[PDB]
Amino acid sequence: IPEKLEYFINKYAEHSHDKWSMDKLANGWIYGEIYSDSSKIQPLMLLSEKEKEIYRWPIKESLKTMLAWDLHAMAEMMAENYHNIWAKKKKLELESKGGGNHPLLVPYDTLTAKEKAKDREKAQDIFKFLQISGYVVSRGXXXXXXXXXXXXXXXXXXXXXXXXXXX
């Protein structure tokens, strides 16, 4: 957790709260201490106290995985991490309670497109703000080099052939 990014965490939390506020004012949500869903009344204007910070909490964790591990590659890796953390939580709870089998208990290269899009949405949401703030992030000629490698292999083969023809 870098110091300047730790500073920016609060500002990004505020910006995401403002975006969700625009969404909830488009939908219709007025502040009210009583908890309800059919009455369209919530005390944090259906995001509760902890529910408002559920998505803010793993931003720092995503940053730590970023540091511990170009742009599309980071997006797909962050999506993979978003699915891996949820898969670990789900498998842990199902092993704890001995429940049913979830169709999401499969490697990420098999999932349906919607299951990957769901986490890719949040991934791009957090990445666009990192891009606007000037944070250059990555994962962390070719034909000519290939031709050179081929030439070296050919030289080795020629050495071998000379050794063989010497006999």
Curated annotation (Swiss-Prot):
PTM summary: Channel activity is modulated by phosphorylation. Phosphorylation is increased in failing heart, leading to calcium leaks and increased cytoplasmic Ca(2+) levels.
Sequence repeat spans: 70-140
Effect of disrupting the coding gene: Embryonically lethal. Embryos die at about 10 dpc, due to defects in heart tube development. Cardiac myotubes display enlarged rough endoplasmic reticulum and cytoplasmic vesicles that contain high levels of Ca(2+).
Highest taxon listed in the record's lineage: Eukaryota
Annotated compartments: Sarcoplasmic reticulum membrane
Coiled-coil annotated residue ranges, if any: none
Tissue-by-tissue expression: Highly expressed in heart, lung, cerebellum and brain. Detected at lower levels in adrenal gland, stomach, thymus, esophagus and ovary.
Domain notes per entry: The calcium release channel activity resides in the C-terminal region while the remaining part of the protein resides in the cytoplasm.
Function text: Cytosolic calcium-activated calcium channel that mediates the release of Ca(2+) from the sarcoplasmic reticulum into the cytosol and thereby plays a key role in triggering cardiac muscle contraction. Aberrant channel activation can lead to cardiac arrhythmia. In cardiac myocytes, calcium release is triggered by increased Ca(2+) cytosolic levels due to activation of the L-type calcium channel CACNA1C. The calcium channel activity is modulated by formation of heterotetramers with RYR3. Required for cellular calcium ion homeostasis. Required for embryonic heart development.
Family to which this protein belongs: Belongs to the ryanodine receptor (TC 1.A.3.1) family. RYR2 subfamily.
Quaternary structure annotation from Swiss-Prot or TrEMBL: Homotetramer. Can also form heterotetramers with RYR1 and RYR3. Interacts with CALM and S100A1; these interactions regulate channel activity. Identified in a complex composed of RYR2, FKBP1B, PKA catalytic subunit, PRKAR2A, AKAP6, and the protein phosphatases PP2A and PP1. Interacts directly with FKBP1B, PKA, PP1 and PP2A. Interacts with FKBP1A and FKBP1B; these interactions may stabilize the channel in its closed state and prevent Ca(2+) leaks. Interacts with SELENON. Identified in a complex, composed of FSD2, CMYA5 and RYR2.
Name recorded for this polypeptide: Ryanodine receptor 2
The species this protein was found in: Mus musculus
Biological classification of the source: Eukaryota, Metazoa, Chordata, Craniata, Vertebrata
Gene: Ryr2
Coverage span on the entire protein: 2712 to 2905 of 4966
